[PDB]
Amino acid sequence: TQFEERHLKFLQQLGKGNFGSVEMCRYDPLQDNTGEVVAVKKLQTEEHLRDFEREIEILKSLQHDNIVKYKGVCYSGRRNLKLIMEYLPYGSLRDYLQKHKERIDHIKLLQYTSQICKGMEYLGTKRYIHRDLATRNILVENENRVKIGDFGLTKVLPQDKEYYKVKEPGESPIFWYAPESLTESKFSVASDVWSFGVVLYELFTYIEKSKSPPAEFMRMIGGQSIVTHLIELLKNNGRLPRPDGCPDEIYMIMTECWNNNVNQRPSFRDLALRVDQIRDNM
C-alpha cells in the first residue's frame, strides 16, 4: 500500500531517540479527518540512512501477533524517508505498566512475558538479533496483547556464524547488555535472552525508578568507566536482586538468563513453556 506525504497529517510526537523520532499521524487521502491513525518513524547521515533501510526491510519481513505491523514507506526521497506502522494506542509496556500497575497482577505480567518470548522466538527463526529488548521497546495493543515495537538496533546473523559483532560508537543500554556484549560487542540469541531476563526484572519491579536496572547496578558499583565497573560486577556474579514478591520459578528464570556462559542460557521456546506453566499453576 502506497503512502503520499501530502496525506500524512502530523498529530503528536510519541517518542524521540538519539537518532530517531516516532509520530502519531492520520493518513487522510479524503482530508475529512476519517483517515487511519498510524505511527511514523523517521531520522533526526548516510550511515544511519543505510541502517534505517535495513530496519525497514527487517520489519517488512516480519508477520506475527507479537510484532508491530509494517504498513509501508512514505518518501518526499531519502532525507524524508518514513517507516509507517500500526498505531497502538496504549503505547510502551514501560508507560502502560507505570500508569496501570494497580490493575495488573502477576498473571497479567506472565501473559505479556509469554507473548514477548513468542515474538522473540519468531525473530530467532529469521536469525534476527534484537539487541534492544526492554519494556520501552514493547507496545500494548490491548489489555491482553503486547508486541515488540521497535527494530532500531536489530541485526541479521551472518550465514555461517551464531553472533554479530557490532562496531558502533553510539550510546548503548548497558544495564540490559550481556557481559560478552559489553566486553567484545558480541550479540546473539543468548544476549537477547540475557536482555529478556532484565525485561522480566522490569515487569516484576513494576518499573519503580528506585528498583530500575540503572538504579540497582549503580548501587552495587558504589577511577574507571561505569562500563568497566559493570563488567567487573557481572564477572564477580553481581546480579539484580529478586523483585519483591517475584515467584521462585520466575526469579530462577531471571538468574538462568543471566548465566555468564552464553551456552547455558535458556531458549525462547523453553522460556515461553516455563512462563506459561508458572502462569497455569497460579
Ligand X SMILES: Cc1cc(Nc2ncc(C)c(N3CC(CC#N)(N4CCN(C)CC4)C3)n2)sn1
Mind telling me the catalytic residues?
132
- Rounded to an integer, what distance in angstroms lies between the CA atom of residue 173 and that of residue 99? 23
Minimum Å gap between C-beta 153 and its own copies is 29
Q: Where in 193-212 is the site for its own copies (CB under 8 A)?
A: 204-206, 208, 210
Minimum Å gap between C-beta 13 and ligand X is 9
Q: Which does 85 bind (CB under 5 to 8 A by kind): ligand X, its own copies, none?
A: ligand X
DSSP string for residues in 215-228? HHHHHHH----HHH
Q: Which does 44 bind (CB under 5 to 8 A by kind): ligand X, its own copies, none?
A: none
**Given the complex with its own copies, which of 82 and 211 has the nearer CB atom?**
211
20 annotated as a binding-site residue: yes
* Amino acid identity at 7: H
Minimum Å gap between C-beta 255 and its own copies is 12
Long-range CB pairs of 24-27, under 8 A, 24+ apart, other chains included: 24/87, 25/84, 27/3, 27/84
Minimum Å gap between C-beta 217 and its own copies is 16
Q: Which residues bind ligand X (CB under 6 A)?
A: 14-17, 20, 22, 39, 68, 85, 87-89, 91-92, 137, 139, 149-150, 152
Q: Assess 247 for contact with its own copies (CB under 8 A).
A: yes
Residue with the CB atom nearest ligand X in the bound state: 149
223 annotated as a binding-site residue: no
First to last CA, the chain: 44
Question: Distances from the Cα of 231 to the Cαs of 29, 77, 260, 266, in angstroms?
Answer: 53, 43, 11, 21
Q: Are strands 20-27 and 8-16 parallel, antiparallel or unpaired?
A: antiparallel
Cβ pair 260, 237 in contact under 8 A: yes
State the residue for C-alpha cell 520489519.
59
**Given the complex with ligand X, which of 132 and 216 has the nearer CB atom?**
132
**Given the complex with ligand X, which of 88 and 240 has the nearer CB atom?**
88
Nearest to 268 by CA among 200, 168, 196: 196
Question: Distances from the Cα of 229 to the Cαs of 15, 258, 267, 277, in angstroms?
Answer: 30, 17, 28, 37
Q: Assess 282 for contact with its own copies (CB under 8 A).
A: yes
Minimum Å gap between C-beta 16 and ligand X is 6
- Single out the segment in contact with its own copies by CB under 8 A; choices: 12-20, 31-39, 47-55, 242-250: 242-250
Cell numbers found for residue 18: 538519539
Q: Assess 133 for contact with its own copies (CB under 8 A).
A: no
Q: Assess 238 for contact with its own copies (CB under 8 A).
A: no
Nearest to 138 by CA among 130, 60, 215, 277: 130
Cβ pair 43, 19 in contact under 8 A: yes
Q: Which does 51 bind (CB under 5 to 8 A by kind): its own copies, ligand X, none?
A: none
Q: Where in 107-126 is the site for its own copies (CB under 8 A)?
A: 109
Binding annotation: 14-22, 41
Residue numbers of the site for its own copies (CB under 8 A)? Answer: 101-103, 105-106, 109, 204-206, 208, 210, 241-248, 282
Binding annotation for ATP: 14-22, 41
